[PDB]
Design a protein around this ligand. Structure first.
Ligand code: O7E
Ligand code: O7E
Lengths: 215, 215
């Protein structure tokens, strides 16, 4: 992805989300849109962004339901124009496979969320995360999400998935993660608040990128 | 809830969802709306149903993100008129607490999803589910979701949460669960396909209810 930087656009107002995304578009080719924006402004926001900005859109829907419901969510999401969808692995292999099947049908991609970045991830997800990643490998998943806040975990994830899999990583900036350290293991970093709450989002993005280029 | 039966309205077309819900409304007072319908028709569908049918709406959004994102999802969902939201416990206590805080702010309810009903739930969720339920109890959660497909698990869940907590249970009918057995432990059952794919949804609902009344 451009500059190895993915914007997490979690503003909840269309006007603010369009302003910030336009201001930083010279520095990214990929925007992650989640439920904060979609549930406030509608699924049509995905195609609007995709067209306006000529970006890739990752729908961060943390998909975490039974196979039949996951199927439906994925189909609605790809019908709305998303390039990829983020799926939890904790519901197990049939739930993941359901999403992979729809992505295969519709020519899209699944990202498997393996271990989360926030403190509560230590309670239950972290102990399962290596197995969740191995399950991904055995299902043929090629794209993964793991935590900037724990680069030792992010290194173990990378070890499981191999060098050819694509790994993106949230938790940079606001949550405490570091761009450069995270990019030792991840292919791209996700950044939300450190850019979209900045007084100058373009300057915030540019500053991050200047630290990425130095790598 | 009326007749201890909650409709899972996972049709993806507004006209079909309104037809079926209207046909079975004499038999329920509570509809569960999830992402299949909301991502196809918009969040406005919640208030439309709530008003048209004078039902309670549970937003089944399987909320499974970091605390700050969960906050945003909950606020958008309650702003849309939902009475309650379903939240995963697997992301840990801070993610759950974030949802509880918004519900307290907005006079709404959280349901904690503890153990899922599909086969893949055995991989990772089932081994954590008793702890997830105990975490719920220690956070003050009063409403829970557990699986009709495993009534021995559903009994253990009930044992943890006590007799005063409210427990609802999906997996009845299509997934193999039985109404009467499930209602030995759950206060209400969730039913989707066995009603909404039936040639006569009202007759399907009535048949289920006639088996519930016999209990
Ligand atoms: C939960 C599914 O989505 C994610 O991508 C995600 C997983 C995770 O472990 N950590 C994480 O922060 N994210 C998401 O990535 C974004 C992080 O934004 P920020 O902390 O503001 O830089 C935000 O949308 C959050 O919901
Ligand atoms: C995943 C969050 O939501 C749920 O309520 C849920 C959890 C679970 O373990 N099992 C389960 O079936 N559900 C939901 O409950 C509904 C079951 O519908 P059905 O099987 O058609 O009777 C459906 O919306 C499904 O997504």
């Amino acid at each position: 992805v451009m500059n190895r930087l993915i914007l997490a656009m979690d503003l909840m107002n269309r006007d603010d989300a369009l302003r910030v995304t336009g201001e930083v578009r010279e520095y990214i080719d990929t925007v992650k849109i989640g439920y904060p924006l979609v549930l406030s402004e509608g699924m049509d926001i995905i195609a609007e962004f995709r067209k306006r900005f000529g970006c890739r859109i990752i729908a961060d829907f943390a998909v975490a339901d039974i196979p039949e419901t996951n199927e439906k969510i994925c189909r609605a999401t790809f019908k709305a124009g998303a390039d990829a969808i983020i799926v939890h692995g904790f519901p197990g292999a049939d739930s993941v496979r359901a999403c992979l099947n729809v992505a295969e049908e519709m020519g899209r991609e699944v990202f498997l969320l393996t271990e989360m970045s926030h403190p509560g991830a230590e309670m239950f997800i972290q102990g399962a995360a290596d197995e969740i990643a191995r399950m991904g490998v055995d299902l043929g998943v090629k794209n993964y999400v793991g935590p900037s806040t724990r680069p030792e975990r992010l290194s173990r994830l990378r070890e499981i998935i191999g060098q050819d899999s694509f790994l993106i990583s949230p938790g940079v900036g606001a949550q405490g993660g570091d761009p450069g350290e995270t990019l030792r293991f991840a292919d791209a970093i996700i950044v939300g608040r450190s850019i979209y709450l900045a007084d100058n989002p373009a300057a915030a993005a540019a500053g991050i990128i200047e630290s990425i280029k130095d790598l």
